[PDB]
Symmetry: C7
Subunit: 256 residues, 7 copies
C-alpha cells in the first residue's frame, strides 16, 4: 500500500496551504489598511485571496489522491454557487453599508426620509440601518433598500423654509392682509431677512381668499417659528377685524 | 467476465465514500460549533462538505464502471440545478431566519409592523415567522420577505410619545386652551416631565382651531395615558366653557 | 457490415440501463419512505436518480454508435433545459405544496386570508390550493403564490377579540356610557372575563363622542357575541336616554 | 477530388438521419398515447426526441465534411437559443394550456374571474383562453397569465349565498324588522332552509340602522331570489310602516 | 512567403461559403413556403440557417489562417450576444406579431381594449399595432405588450347587451315602473326579444329606488338603442307621473 | 535572450492587426451604407467586425508571448462582460433610437403622450427624446422607455373630434335642447358635416339632464371650435330660456 | 529542493507583471485623455487593461508553481463574479453619472423633477445626484434611477406659460369678463405679446362659469407675473361688479 502515502501528502498540502493562505491574506489587508482604503473593503478583498488560495490548495491536494482536477473546479463551483445565493441579499446590503458610511448622504443624528419612512438616524450597520421615528418607534431598514432609493435629508442644510397658507374672507382688504402678515414676519427676529420673504394673494378659493406666506429661518427655529407666527396671525387678524371664513354656501330657496 | 469486478469495486468506493464523507462533515461542524459560529450556519456549511465529498465519490466510483467522468459532472450538475430551483425560496428564507435570530431587530414578544401587517412576535422558525394580531388572528410571514422589507419595532424603545389633536371653536381663548391642556399634562404623573411637552396652536382649520399636544411616557403607559388624558380634556373643556365645534357652514339665503 | 453489431449493442445497453435505472430508483425511495422523509420528496429525489441513470445509459449507448459523447451531454442538456422552462412554475408550486402540507400554517378547514382573498381551506394539491369563500365561490390559488405571501389564519388561535366602536352625542354622561357598556359585557357569559375588557372614551369625533369596547371570546362565539352585544347596546342606550347622533352641522344664517 | 466524396456521404447521413429521427419519434408518442399520458405532452416530449436525433445527425453529417464537431454544438446552441427566446412566452402558455385542461379548475361554460376580468368560459386553446363577458364583450387571456393568478370560479359549487343589507330608521322596532324579514325568507321556497338563515342587526349606521340578511339558494336561483326577496322587503316594510331613511342631518340654527 | 497562400484560400472559403449559405437558405424557405408554414416564420427559420452556415464558413476560413477555431466560437459568441441584447425587444415583438396575425384575436377594423387603451384596430405590423381612438388620437402599441396582456374585443361577438339603471322616487308604484319600462322595451324592434329582457327593482338606494333594465340588441344597434330607450324612459316617466328624484335630505331643525 | 524576439513579433501582430481590422471594418460599412441599411446599424454592425478582428489579433499576438490562448478568451470575455453591463441601458436606448427614427410613430413636431407625459416632440437622439410641454417645461425621455410603452399621437391623424357634455334642468324641453344644439353645430363651418354629428340625451343625472354633442373638425380647428361652440351654447341657452342647473337638493324639514 | 526555485521565479513574474501592467495602463489613458474621450471612461477602460494584464500575470506566475492554468481562470472567475455582484449597482450608477454630465439634460442650477421629487440641482457625482427642494430639504438620488426615468427640466427653456382659471357667476356678462381679463394682460409688460394670449370661456361649471387665461412670459417673471395678474383680476372684477361665486345650491323645501 505504497500508494497510501499520497493520503499523507494530501494532508500536508492542506495544512501548509491553509497556513500559507492565512498569512498572505493577513499580510495583504495589513497593506491595504496601511494605505487608507476602508476597513470593510480590505477585509472583503482580503478574504477573497484567502478563500482563493485554499481553493487552489484543495484542487492540488485532492489531485494527489486522484480527484480528476476538473471535478474539484465543478464541485467547489456548485458549493460556492449555493453559498452565493444564500448570502447575496447580505452581500448587497454589506456593500450599501460601505457606500453609506463612506459618502454620508446622511450621518448619524440627521432626520431623513428613506422611502416613505422617516426618522432620526441612529447607526448604519453591516446590513441594516436603524432610525427612531419622532414618536419613538424604531425602524430597521436594509442598507440595500436605502441606497437604491431616494434619500431625503431634512438636516444637512442649515437654513430652511416655512410656508403658511392663510385663508381670509372674500370681502377682506387685500392690502390690509398683506400689511399685517408682512409686519408679523418683519418683526420676528428668527426669520432670515436677507432671504425670500413672500407674502402674496395666491389662490382665489372655494370659500376663502388664500394668501401664501413663505419665510426662511435657521433649521432649529423652523418648528417654533411656524407655531409662533401662526398664533400671531390668528390674534392680529381677529383684533384687526379680518375673518377666517367658515365654509360657505349660497342656498336658493323653493317652496314646493 | 473479469471486467465485472469493477462493479464490486464501484460499490466499495461508494460505501467507503459515504462513510468518509459522513465522518469528515460531522467532524467539521463539531469544530465550528466549538468555536461559536451558529448552529444553523454550521449544519449548512457542513452539509456542503458532506454532499461535496459524496459527489467526488460518485465521480470516481462510476468512473471505474466507464462512466466518462465529464458526464457525471454534467448529470449531477443538472440534478443539483433541478433541486436548486425547487428549494431556493426555502434557502433564501432559511438565511433570513439566521439573520433575524442573530440580529434580533425584533425579539419574540415585541410588537412589530412587518410590511403592512403588525402583531406581537411569537417565534422565528426555519422559513417563516409567526405573529399574533392584537385581536387574535395569526399571521405567518416568510423570513425572506421580512428581511428585505422595513422592520418597524414598537417595543424595543423604552419611552414613547402620544400626540393629541384637539379642535376647539374659533372664538375660544387661545391662552385659556393652552393653560388647561398644560395643567392637565403637568399633573399627570405618567407623563415624563424631563422630555418634550408641546402644547400649541397648530392648525387654523376648516371649522375648528386645532391644538396639538405631544407628551412622552413609558412604553407601557402610552395607551392608558392617552385615554385618561382625553377623557380629561373633554371634561375640563366642558366645565371651563370651551366648545368642541360641530362642522360649520355659513348659509346665504335667497328667496327665488 | 461487422460494424453494424454496435447497433445491437446500443439497444442492449438501453434495455439493461432502463431496467438497472428503474430498480435502483425504486430501491432508493423504498429506503427514504422507510425512514420518514415525505412521500412526494421521495418520489422526486428518486425520479432524479432514475432520469440520471438513463442519462448515463444514453451517453454510453449512443457512444458505441459513434455519437461523440460530448454531443450527448449537449443535446440532452438542451432537451432538459427546454423541459425545465416549460415545467418550472409547476416545480415551484410542487415544492410549495410539500412545505404547506408539512408545516400546516393552515390546515384543511381553517378560514384564512391568502393575500387579498380569504376562504375556508378545502384541500392543498400538487400545484394548487382550493378554498371556499364564505358565500360559495371557489378559489384556486397556486401553491407557489401562497408560500411567498403572508398567511393570515383566522382559526388556529382558540380565543379571539371583538372591537365595538359606539358613537354617542357630546352632551351624554361619560360615566353613564361606560357603566351601561361595562354592565352589558359583564353579564354576557360568552365574554372571557379573565382577559382584556376595555370600555373607554377613545375619540373626540366629528359629530359624536366615540367609545371603544374590546372584549375576548372563544373563536366560535365571536360572531354571535358581536351581534348580540350590539342589539343590546342599542336597546339599553335608547331605554336609558343616550342618543346615537345623526351627523351634525351648525349653520350660520345670512339674509342677502 | 476524391475528398469530394464526403459531400455525398454528408447528404446520405442527413437523409437517413431525418428518416431515422422521424420514425423513432413517431414510434415514441405512439407508445405514450397508448399508455394515457396526454396528447400535447406526448407531441412535445416526442418532438424533442425528433429534433434531438436530427441534432446528432447534423453533427456527424457536417463532421464528415470537416466541421470540427464542437462548432456544431456551438452554432446549433445559438440557433436553439435564438428560437428559445422568440418562443418562450408561447412555451409557457402552451404548458399552462395543458394544466388548465387536465385540472379543470374551470371548465367550458363556468363563469369565472381570472384576475380582474370575469366572464363565461368558452374554450381553452394552445396559448390563450376565451371568455364572454355577461354583456357580450369577448376577452382573450393568455394561458400563462391565468395559471399564475388566482382562479375564482362562480359555478363549480352547486349552492351559493345572497347577502342583503337593509337600512331602516333608528326609531324602527328591532323585533318587528327581524320578524318581517324572517317571515319573508321563511316563505320563499327557493331559499335552502337546512342552511344558514341569518337575519340580524349588524351596524349602527350613519343615518340608518343596518340589518344583514344572509340566505342560501341553488346557484341557478341566486339571482332571481335576490331580486324577488328585495321587491318583497320594500313592499312589506312600506305596508308595515317601517321607513327606509333618507340621509339625515341635525342642523343647529344661528341668526348672525 | 509560401504560407501567404492560406490568405488566398481563406477568401475562397468565404466566397464559396457565403454563396453556399445563400443558396441553401433560399432553398429551405422555398420548401417551407410551399408547405404552408407562414411567410415570417419561414424568413426567420431560414435566416438562421443562412447565418449558421456563414458561421461555419467563418470558422474554417479563419482557421486556415491559424485562428485557433475555439477563439472564433468565442468571438462570434460575443458578437451574437451583443446583437442579441440590442434586438430582443424586437424579436419578442416580431413573434407577437406573427401570433396576432395568425390567431386574429382581433382583426383590423374591430374595436378593442388592449390593456387600458381602446380603439379601432388599423394594422398589425412587424413590432407594433396601430389603433384609432374613437375621437381621433392614434395609438401605437408594441406587439409584445399586447400578447401578454388581456385582449378585450368589443366587435367579434354579433349581439351585445345594454344595461340601464333608472332611479325613481321611493313613493313610486313598483308595478307601474316595471310596466312602463317593460312596455318601452317590448315595443322597440331593435331589442332581441328571444334573449334576456330583465326589468327589475335592483337597489334600495340613497335617495332613489333603482331599477335595472337589461336588453340585448345587434352590435350595430347597441349605441342607438341605448339613447333612444333613454329619451323614451324620461318622456314616458314624466307624462306618467313618475319622479326621478333629486338628492334627498331630512333636516332636523334646532333653534339655539 | 533570443526568446525576447517574440516580444517584438507580438507588437508587429498588434499593429498589423489593428490596421487590418480598421480597414476591413471601414470597408464593410462602406458596403452597407451603399446598399441602404441605416447609418447607425451600419456603424454598429461594422464596429463589431472591428472589435472582433482586434480580438483575434490580441489572441494570436499575446499567444506568441506564451499567453495560453484559452486565457485570452477568458480575460477578454470578462472585460467585455464588465463593459457590457455598464453600457446596456445605453445599447437598449440606442436601438430604440433607430426604431423610432426609422418608423416615425411620431415625427418631430407632433404632439404625443409617451406614457403619462405629453408634449410636442423636438428631436430623437442616440439615447433620449426631447419634447416640450404645452406650458414650456422640457422633458427628456429615454428612447428605451418610449419604445416599450404605448405611443399616443395627437397629430398624425388630420381630422379629430370634440365631445361636449351639456347639463340642463330636468324640466327643460328635450326637443328644444336638441334643436338649439343641432342649429349651433349646423351653422359652424369648421365642423365637418360629412362626418358624425351626434346631439343626444345621454345621461339622466344627479341634478341635471345631460346632453352629449360630438362633432368632427380639422385637427387645427378642434381647440377653437370647442371654445367657440361653448360660448355659443351658453349664450343661446340663456336667451332661449334653458337653465344650466346648480346642484339640487330636496330638504325635508322637521321642527324638533 | 531545486524545484523551490520556481517560487522565486513566480514572484519575479508578479513584480514584473504588476509594473508592466501599471505602465501600459497609465500609457493607454494618457492616449485616451489626449484625444478627448472623457476622464471617467478613460480611467475605467484603462483600469480594465490594468486588471486584465495582472490577470494574465497571475495565470502564468501561479502556473510555474503547478497551478493547472484552467483552475486560475476558474478561481479568478469566481472572485470577479463575487466582486461584480457586490459592485454593479455602483457600476450602473457610475455609468449614468457619465451620461448625465456628458449630455446635460439638466445642468447644475436648473430646477428639475426627477421622478416625483423636484428641486434645484447642485452637483452630479460618481453614483448620486444632489438637489435642494424649494423649501430646503436635500435629496440624494441615485444616478442610475435618474437616467432610466423621465427628466422634467423647468429651466432649460427661456420662456414659459402661466394658466389662470377664473370662475365667475353664471349671470356675469361674457363679453365683459373677456374684456377686463384681456385688458389686464394687454397692459402687463412682462407678458410676451408676440406669443399665445388666450382669454376664453372654457368650462360650464358646477356653480361657476370658468374662464381660462393663458399667457407667456420670460422664465424669471413667470411666478411674479402670476401673482400680480391675480391680485389684479380680483381687484378689477370687484370694482367692475363681477362676482366670484361661493358654492351654490338650489334647495327645495318640504314641510312634513
Amino acid at each position: 500500500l505504497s500508494y497510501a502515502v499520497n493520503i499523507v501528502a494530501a494532508l500536508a498540502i492542506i495544512i501548509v496551504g491553509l497556513i500559507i493562505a492565512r498569512m498572505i491574506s493577513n499580510a495583504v489587508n495589513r497593506l491595504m489598511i496601511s494605505r487608507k482604503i476602508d476597513a470593510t473593503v480590505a477585509c472583503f478583498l482580503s478574504a477573497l485571496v484567502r478563500y482563493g488560495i485554499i481553493a487552489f490548495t484543495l484542487i492540488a491536494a485532492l489531485g494527489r489522491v486522484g480527484v480528476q482536477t476538473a471535478s474539484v473546479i465543478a464541485v467547489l463551483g456548485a458549493a460556492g454557487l449555493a453559498v452565493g445565493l444564500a448570502l447575496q441579499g447580505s452581500l448587497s446590503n454589506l456593500a450599501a453599508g460601505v457606500l453609506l458610511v463612506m459618502f454620508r448622504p446622511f450621518r448619524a443624528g440627521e432626520y431623513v426620509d428613506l422611502g416613505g419612512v422617516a426618522g432620526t438616524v441612529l447607526s448604519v450597520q453591516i446590513f441594516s440601518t436603524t432610525m427612531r421615528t419622532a414618536d419613538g418607534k424604531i425602524i430597521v431598514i436594509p442598507n440595500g433598500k436605502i441606497i437604491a432609493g431616494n434619500i431625503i435629508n431634512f438636516s444637512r442644510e442649515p437654513v430652511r423654509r416655512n410656508e403658511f397658507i392663510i385663508g381670509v374672507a372674500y370681502d377682506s382688504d387685500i392690502d390690509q392682509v398683506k400689511q399685517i402678515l408682512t409686519n408679523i414676519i418683519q418683526s420676528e427676529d428668527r426669520i432670515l431677512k436677507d432671504r425670500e420673504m413672500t407674502v402674496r394673494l395666491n389662490e382665489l378659493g372655494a370659500s376663502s381668499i388664500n394668501f401664501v406666506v413663505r419665510v426662511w429661518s435657521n433649521s432649529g427655529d423652523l418648528q417654533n417659528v411656524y407655531w409662533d407666527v401662526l398664533e400671531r396671525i390668528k390674534r392680529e387678524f381677529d383684533a384687526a377685524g379680518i375673518s377666517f371664513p367658515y365654509p360657505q354656501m349660497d342656498v336658493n330657496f323653493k317652496r314646493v
